[PDB]
């Protein structure tokens, strides 16, 4: 769709769950298109700035997650096709990871990047 | 698995190349000429050429047709072996973490190892810990 495409190359971030690469405007106006009932990051900027960080490396044009080698490797085959990332550094605080396990969402470290 | 094909672009024009190709796809998925491409990989580390991912060499040719960015390499599509579908995703240590050790580019403390104290959420400025090397206004006039 037209909402998953970042409008402007300025002020872009990436999520920690589905690696959603968007503009600061989209995260507040629309939010995470692959998780809206567990994260609820539409309608504010503190929740967008809390979970979602700017600290990420690399972009991918996810189009066909049902048939692709890259999609399986990043465990992003059950997501919506769009702008994704390959290495999203950081970690969620101990305030929203405890509620994700009780609801059935296993928060995985998306950071596939090696350390030294 | 879809196959990785390499294509030339002018220096630094790869970011506009990536976003317009995504938009192209979306712009043509419902017409009579769709795109056979899966993804496009555009690493932060590389320069001068980018990676397009599709089953056959005809597919990329018929897809990158009409773009003024990938016109220059359009005549050839150097492939990589199966073992190179993995090392493209690898990232060596973004680069934004407090209490870390960064260096400068410009200013007076060039190539001087400093430290970060606080990060501004506006993405405008950043706090640095350096040591002043001025003369305290004694030698200079
Ligand atoms: Zn997500």
PDB file of N, CA, C and O and ligand atoms in Angstrom, chain A residues 15 17-19 32 34, ligand 1:
ATOM      1  N   UNK A  15      11.219  -0.131  14.018  1.00  0.00           N
ATOM      2  CA  UNK A  15      10.680  -0.849  15.103  1.00  0.00           C
ATOM      3  C   UNK A  15      11.569  -2.000  15.519  1.00  0.00           C
ATOM      4  O   UNK A  15      12.459  -2.405  14.767  1.00  0.00           O
ATOM      5  N   UNK A  17      10.087  -5.023  16.681  1.00  0.00           N
ATOM      6  CA  UNK A  17       9.326  -6.257  16.508  1.00  0.00           C
ATOM      7  C   UNK A  17       9.299  -6.706  15.052  1.00  0.00           C
ATOM      8  O   UNK A  17       9.719  -7.822  14.732  1.00  0.00           O
ATOM      9  N   UNK A  18       8.807  -5.847  14.160  1.00  0.00           N
ATOM     10  CA  UNK A  18       8.721  -6.147  12.738  1.00  0.00           C
ATOM     11  C   UNK A  18       9.653  -5.288  11.893  1.00  0.00           C
ATOM     12  O   UNK A  18       9.615  -5.386  10.662  1.00  0.00           O
ATOM     13  N   UNK A  19      10.483  -4.463  12.443  1.00  0.00           N
ATOM     14  CA  UNK A  19      11.460  -3.698  11.766  1.00  0.00           C
ATOM     15  C   UNK A  19      10.861  -2.761  10.743  1.00  0.00           C
ATOM     16  O   UNK A  19      11.369  -2.642   9.628  1.00  0.00           O
ATOM     17  N   UNK A  32       2.386   1.153  13.746  1.00  0.00           N
ATOM     18  CA  UNK A  32       2.910  -0.125  13.273  1.00  0.00           C
ATOM     19  C   UNK A  32       1.795  -0.870  12.546  1.00  0.00           C
ATOM     20  O   UNK A  32       0.805  -1.274  13.165  1.00  0.00           O
ATOM     21  N   UNK A  34       2.005  -3.819  11.242  1.00  0.00           N
ATOM     22  CA  UNK A  34       2.076  -5.248  11.524  1.00  0.00           C
ATOM     23  C   UNK A  34       1.747  -5.589  12.970  1.00  0.00           C
ATOM     24  O   UNK A  34       1.634  -6.775  13.298  1.00  0.00           O
TER      25      UNK A  34
HETATM   26 ZN1  LIG C   1       6.802  -4.872  14.157  1.00  0.00          ZN
END
